[PDB]
From a paper:
The transcription enzyme complex (TEC) is comprised of λ3 and μ2 and is attached inside the inner layer. Asymmetric sub-particle reconstruction yielded near-atomic resolution (up to 3.0 Å) structures for five types of viral particles, all with visible side chain densities for atomic model building: from 6 h post-infection, core, virion, empty core, and empty virion were reconstructed; and for 48 h post-infection, structures of virion, empty virion, and outer shell particle were obtained. Inside the particle, reconstructions of virion and core particles clearly show that the layered RNA genome and densities of TEC (at red arrows) are underneath the inner shell, indicating that genome replication from ssRNA to dsRNA has been completed in the core. However, an asymmetric reconstruction of the TEC was obtained after focused classification in virions only, not in the empty virion. This result suggests that the RNA genome is important for stable docking of TEC to the inner layer protein shell, though it is not required for TEC incorporation into the capsid, as also suggested by the tomograms. The λ2 pentameric turret changes conformation during virus assembly: in the core, the turret is open, with a central channel 75 Å in diameter; in the virion, it closes, sealing off the channel. As the proteins μ1/σ3 coat the core to form the outer layer of the virion, the last two of the three Ig-like domains, acting as a rigid body, flip down 46° to close the channel, which is then sealed by σ1 attachment. Studies have shown that assembled core particles in the condensates are active in mRNA transcription, but this activity is inhibited after outer layer proteins μ1/σ3 and σ1 are incorporated to form virion particles. Our structural data align with these functional findings: in the core, the open conformation of the turret maximally facilitates mRNA export efficiency, while in the virion, the closed conformation of the turret suppresses transcription, leading to a virion in the quiescent state. The coating of outer layer proteins μ1, σ3, and σ1 occurs continuously throughout capsid formation and completes the virion particles, which eventually egress from the cell.
Residue numbers in the entry:
A (entry chain F), B (entry chain B): 43 to 675
C (entry chain H): 43 to 72, 95 to 679
D (entry chain J): 377 to 430
E (entry chain E), F (entry chain A): 1 to 42
Amino acid sequence: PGGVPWIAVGDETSVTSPGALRRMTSKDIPETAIINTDNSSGAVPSESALVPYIDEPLVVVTEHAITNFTKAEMALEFNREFLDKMRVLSVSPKYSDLLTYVDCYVGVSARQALNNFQKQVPVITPTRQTMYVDSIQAALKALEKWEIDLRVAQTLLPTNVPIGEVSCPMQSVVKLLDDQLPDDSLIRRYPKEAAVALAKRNGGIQWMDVSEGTVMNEAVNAVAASALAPSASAPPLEEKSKLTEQAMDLVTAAEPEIIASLAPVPAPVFAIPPKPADYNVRTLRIDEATWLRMIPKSMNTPFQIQVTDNTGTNWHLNLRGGTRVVNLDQIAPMRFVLDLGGKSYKETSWDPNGKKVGFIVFQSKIPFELWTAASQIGQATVVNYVQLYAEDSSFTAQSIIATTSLAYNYEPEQLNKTDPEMNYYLLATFIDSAAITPTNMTQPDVWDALLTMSPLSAGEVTVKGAVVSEVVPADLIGSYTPESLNASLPNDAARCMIDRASKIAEAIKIDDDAGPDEYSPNSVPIQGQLAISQLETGYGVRIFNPKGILSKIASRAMQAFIGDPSTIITQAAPVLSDKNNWIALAQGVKTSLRTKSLSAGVKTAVSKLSSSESIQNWTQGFLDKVSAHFPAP
Amino acid sequence: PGGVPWIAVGDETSVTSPGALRRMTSKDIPETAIINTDNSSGAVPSESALVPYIDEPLVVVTEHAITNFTKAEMALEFNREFLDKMRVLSVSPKYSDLLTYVDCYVGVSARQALNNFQKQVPVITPTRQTMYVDSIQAALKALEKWEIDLRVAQTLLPTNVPIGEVSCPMQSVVKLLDDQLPDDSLIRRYPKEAAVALAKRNGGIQWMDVSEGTVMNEAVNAVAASALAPSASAPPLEEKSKLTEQAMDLVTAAEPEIIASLAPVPAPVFAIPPKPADYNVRTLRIDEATWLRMIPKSMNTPFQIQVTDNTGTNWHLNLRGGTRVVNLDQIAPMRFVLDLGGKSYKETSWDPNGKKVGFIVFQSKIPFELWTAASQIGQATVVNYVQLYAEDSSFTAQSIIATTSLAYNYEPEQLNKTDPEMNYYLLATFIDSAAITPTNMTQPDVWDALLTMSPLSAGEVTVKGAVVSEVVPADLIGSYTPESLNASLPNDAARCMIDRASKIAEAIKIDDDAGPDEYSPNSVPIQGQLAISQLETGYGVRIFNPKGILSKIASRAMQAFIGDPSTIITQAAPVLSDKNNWIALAQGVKTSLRTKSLSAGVKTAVSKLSSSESIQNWTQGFLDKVSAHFPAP
Amino acid sequence: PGGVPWIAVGDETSVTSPGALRRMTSKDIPYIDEPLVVVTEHAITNFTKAEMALEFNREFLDKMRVLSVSPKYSDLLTYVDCYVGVSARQALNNFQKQVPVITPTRQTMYVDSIQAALKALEKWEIDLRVAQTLLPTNVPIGEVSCPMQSVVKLLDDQLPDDSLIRRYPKEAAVALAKRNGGIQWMDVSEGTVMNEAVNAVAASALAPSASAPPLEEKSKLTEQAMDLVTAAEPEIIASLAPVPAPVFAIPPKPADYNVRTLRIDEATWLRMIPKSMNTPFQIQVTDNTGTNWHLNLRGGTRVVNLDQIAPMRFVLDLGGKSYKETSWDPNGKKVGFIVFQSKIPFELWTAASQIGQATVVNYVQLYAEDSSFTAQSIIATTSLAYNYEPEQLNKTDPEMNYYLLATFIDSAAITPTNMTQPDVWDALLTMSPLSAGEVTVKGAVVSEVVPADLIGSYTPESLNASLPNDAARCMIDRASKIAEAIKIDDDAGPDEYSPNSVPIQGQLAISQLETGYGVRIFNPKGILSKIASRAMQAFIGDPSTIITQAAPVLSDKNNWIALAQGVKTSLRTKSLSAGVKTAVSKLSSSESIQNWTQGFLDKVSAHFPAPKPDC
Amino acid sequence: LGMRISALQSLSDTPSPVQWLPQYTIDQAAMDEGDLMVSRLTQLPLRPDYGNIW
Amino acid sequence: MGNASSIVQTINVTGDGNVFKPSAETSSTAVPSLSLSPGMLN
Amino acid sequence: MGNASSIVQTINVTGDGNVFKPSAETSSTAVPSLSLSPGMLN
């Protein structure tokens, strides 16, 4: 059981009686007080004036805790000899001797306890439990260097073999250890204790008793070693079970229901931690990127404007046809970083060296495409700016711009977004405290650079460059072209979908070892859907393929999915563009994993066995060399 | 035990054959039926006409399931006061009352149950088990917002300390909560219930009983908290055990015997999910890149050619000296994406704006180097094409091509691949519907671009650009120059081995904290091999070194391997280039981890204690500020 | 219990007594000797379940004439009364009754028999899994139905030719019925159909019910989150005291730079000759083999200062560059790495005397090819490599200087007018650390680091110019794990308070109430909660914001410490729960998947009609 | 009781012992048990006919 | 997956009366993995 | 804990005598997760 012990304050006791139980304290059971403890460890002082007399609560100890703390004691007991040398814990802790067995009501709450009366319930006090744990911790703190040195001694030379047997003269092994052990090792100072400890740990190290002349296995972990050992024609149960466990954890994290839902799914639920993305605005195609706007290349009359910064200083910038801006709305909180390193921006009457470039934000009701005069800019503000420097490049008589890290954070909440007919635009170009003659500088902007965008939130998702509060995962399948995916924003739902499907891919690869054109339990779900679809009635010429061809097609599709996860969202993919196939695979993977029974592939098993035999041969050769170079008397 | 209960058919004391047993049903044990269920939860209807009367099967309940399902109710009992407030589950579920104990044969099959007669076996019906689980889930569904608000209340201010003890006026804390908790919080509606719940959960919060004037601890998780609490000069057992378990899991995933085999291993077994790669074909070198073919220069007589696409449209191409193609044989299924953004391709008699480029595939029997006339191309097909667009660049009076994405999936299955003399090539170049004058266009191809290469399978492995059916991991050590590694294919065995060895790297870094020139149990295996090697007699001059120098060299080698896992395959690596050293380390890691006993690094422990004390001091300072504000009455 | 059985050799027996105990062997249970070990109940149960796994397929094994008798692990144990422990000292205090013991030989034989049966059943298990996964046999929620005759027809049509199911149909049916309770076969003799599964208890944990997600998956998610927090170690990542570099550091990642475009005031590990020398000179350097080479040093040259950087590996790539002048042709030339050890600062070099020791450590040849541009050539890909190891280089002297340079080398003397390029540093450089026990802060190694001091002290330029083994990168990588942990835990939307966001609100309220330098304007609890939620969302979106200078609120280290500490409590105080939005979304999605499965099964039944009874 | 439905073929009495070719399964046991069972079931000692060697 | 029996058959694969009804409560399970940690097995 | 109220029958949140004293030994715990693997559950 678990919880705390209770006593009945009144004669009436029913499963729902009001106010009938009260906590059991140390006064009710005197032998749980600290004054009556078993001071074999010596923690409690023997002076009467140093022991307090106060009431303490009681808690119930469970069998899981009992067993695990006993195993913790055995952890300490593995190194008794060095403990005896250091004169620590002459008497074993024996957790069972700190518990008192009582018959009472047990439960977390009084209502539960009223229905649960048990006999021989172990109880303890927090102070005694702390004392026990403290003793164990003190001993473990003591055994630190001994543990390290023993591990070093074991790992200096091969002590375990994957399969089979190896042997070497023990005198030769001891001579090699004496030659190669460090100077400060405790093993040199205390050989006998190390020998006994290693005999306990490993069943392959056996010492002869000189009095009786007998050798014998002395290990204490045969049961665990049996499960850790590879049987003939089979890999270890530990390895198989652990691999299956990891695969199931991967699928659980991948969350098939969410990744295969046919119904709308909330954006905060669907979203996952994103990653930054890189772009070059100047080389983008506006027909493919929906978050860019550009002045048409027909206005043909550059005009000068003046803007002020937060500090209140004034700057001048020129706007001409072909200028590009980013539509700040509908893109969620974001962080922009611009780098101009490696570009030239050199003109006959313009020297970039020593000039300043900055980010400018515009707010206006007039759409950007109709801007022809300064009156139409609205409210403009310079957010950040940096000065530039030029250095010679590989090309002769060519000076390029040093690296830059211009940064800005778009946070929509800081802006006043109540008015629906308001537009937000972001611009990057040359700025100056003096008027810039349009003929001198003719570049529309400085967007020919490297732009890195990082999402500033993980609760919003975008599709095709616009935010959506709601997402349908299954309907994204086979709806993206490569250029659309390239031009997609960092927080696009496609990237999250790919990242989630990557876990499924890893789980399948862990579970599977099938070669080319071989059917698999993770590949037949697609085959079933194909078989049904080819019989389904529709429009077009019908082609009939047998089960062998269908299985080969399904295996190829599965291999393609494992090789590249983006194929599911890529448009016109051979087989993985069908939502039925995607859902069938997603559902089938979970059942395939759950129906396994401690199994491994035949190919994997035979390969593992061959590799283990090769390693055994290598170990035997090394031990032969050691014996040859350290002769026994 | 486990399985299902069996009973003797007909007469008893006659069970000598498996054919004399049959599965037990609720008809044989009437008190397992629905009508005899104790309906303390009210799930079963009280109307006699609504209670089914049918036979049901029986299953055996394991003690692990008993303990876990019993501990499940503790989650409900932690919040009984709000359950009473919502009038839900007035009586605790009490799983043990749903079981019936009988004496029977226990097994999964009759043959097994024949020899496994046991007494006092608990049995249950699926309907009753489902009822119990449904009740628990209903309560958990009910307690959702209450638990959320309770966690908010606990986390709004620090309620736990890593080490030590802190204090603050409860009245001031209550004032802060009243000032900061949200309006809609259930805590405002139900103060006393929240106080009781938090007193149950945390032992540092204690309420004084007004009538008796007593204050005492009522926490119910002292045993569990003792394991989490860090003792003096020792980290928690929880943290130590969890870290060791994670390291062992990483090694088990990393598969030391596979990554250290000396015999051929199947490609499907060895392979892991790959990653895309990037190349620039024009700037590669033919000697390193074995999958590239070039028309030799000085051929100096370009020739025109016509190729039809799948639809039937005809196109014109020009092939001159210096043109490169990709050998599509022995490279496994793969996908190529080409991007020409940022290039110029501008000549006096050729303007790229509006032109078209595409992928052309040639099948022929003549080697590509000997091609001099149109008759030597065999069959050709244009598989994809795209139109180009140009935009002005930073450089004055120059233009560059916008971002493009031309894709092609090479899968060998679709191609015939039936004749051993057939040669397959891939080429990207300008294509036009009209003939191109050889003087106007002088570029051999459009390969001066960015190529992204992605595998389409996970069962094939390539070595130096050619597919192999099996790979020997031990011979990949120290056999790759940087140029070869850079020019290698995305599905190379070297990348897979690097990824696998990475896991060993994080495992070693997790379980080790050694500084510069400090021996470790994970570094001594290399030292042993070095000592034996220097003792070996062989060709070349031998110089003897001390054990200290050997230990320092081994430690530096291990540190280098941890810093960069790719050094194991790099040619002429200092110490890691030896397969003996690699195998020794890989085998020794398992023993080093498995021989640990709840230990931790000394430097780690000291740092952890110091950091915990610092955090405790910070928490005390914060509580002092909180008490300075919100003054107590 | 646990350990080995012991026997007292004398009559004196106390908690501490010399001798008085010996191992218990095979002869004295009531020939060759073997020891004895104690078997635990956990092992007993696990091996019994291992037997049950085999026993699932009895009907097939009978046809194969394999494993006529079940293993029965419990029949190999002997029960004795004696002292039990790992050491005699523990055994003297631990006396037990009715403990099981076994011998290693019998244990090994039992495990070997189990493994042999497991190998024997491999093809059968694969065929069964294929049969189960061919068509949907499990639904996330609710129920579905389809005629068994139609299902059997579909499997008959689509199963592989070599499947053992075709050879053994009935055995497969029994095996499938013993694993899945949805497949039920009518008993002909009495005409009754009935569930025959043996895993109802296990299935009940996996089954969704009411309006809540499965208990096992909720617990698994919470366990994964706690594991991530443990692997993050908030105490170490939020200490306010110095922490050793070997403890703080983690496996790093390579970094990429372009030396020529970097700024000297941003990179403290670059040293440049002032451009006012305007007097190029010529020097000669001998390589390791003994070959002599020629190179020139002019104003504007840049070198790497190797004294403070930890063990590093440099890789240089020249691909795509021009380096072509009127009187110099890059094609056919050679480039290389030259290391100098001199007692004179690099900025003061004006003649060949000050160079000190020098060595060409590596070199490669260049090849050129035509580019996209007209009448212009570019150098092919280069992979020039070097490893800086400080241990070899004699570091005892405290006034030596170590510089690294890359430039054109040639066997013949190079005229300064022919080549006017200061160096070949205008290329791509990849740096990879070679030791995980060292950490750098803005270009120099430090033995101790204060993690809380790193918060809010980096500009973007500084972060870009930082070395690969910088402390900020390790801090970001460690904070990432808490980022995924919080994201797994929470499902809150915009401007919604969370248990993982309240501590920032508390710290903000306390700081606002605190009186100091500067005017104050009070803000309500709602605005404070909004700010805290936005801060948490920004942190989850980009973990690197914590080290960025002038971050909105995350530059304050108090908020970072409060969040790091509060995550632990928030995770530990959960009680088998999940978010409301998560629960409703899971329910709706499961219902949709159930509808899809029902539609598919209807299509199967339509295209494989069952025979029509005529009774 | 699951058994095949068939009748037994009738054969004459073979006058001499018949050669037998055993086949193996995956079951295993210890050497000592084999020796003990052979000792319990053996018919030795006995005096056979030596025959001719050349 | 055809079948054919002589004289009598307690089970009929292609007969009538069989039930195929997948459900969430029934699910489908085997023994995929077990807890065999060395320290806990001892 | 519990913001503001005025009842003062059994416990008084706003009264005197209560102690708020967090420490490592007491800590704070609930039921976060359980061992419910199918193989172990059987």
